[PDB]
Amino acid sequence: EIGRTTDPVRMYMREMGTVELLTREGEIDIAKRIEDGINQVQCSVAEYPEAITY
């Protein structure tokens, strides 16, 4: 638990122990979600007319 620890890298390794490792397939899905957000922000800035004149 959160005891008497004083090394900050030990607390960093505790606070990074909550997440899990990535499998063979999952990071392609995460990168697809990243590219989906990039495509969404591009397709929402697309139809702005003053950006087209810029």
Partner DNA sequence: TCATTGAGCAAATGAGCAACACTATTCGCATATAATGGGGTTAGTGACTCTTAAGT
d(CA 7, CA 39): 42
9 vs 51, which CB is nearer to DNA?
9
Q: Which of 1, 3, 9, 46 binds DNA (CB under 7 A)?
A: 9
* Chain centre to alpha carbon of residue 14: 20
Is 19:25 a contact under the CB 8 Å cutoff? no
24 vs 51, which CB is nearer to DNA?
24
Residue type at position 54? Y
**Contact between 45 and DNA (CB under 7 A)?**
no
Question: Which residues in this chain contact DNA in the complex, by CB under 7 A?
Answer: 7, 9-10, 13-14, 16-17, 21-22, 27
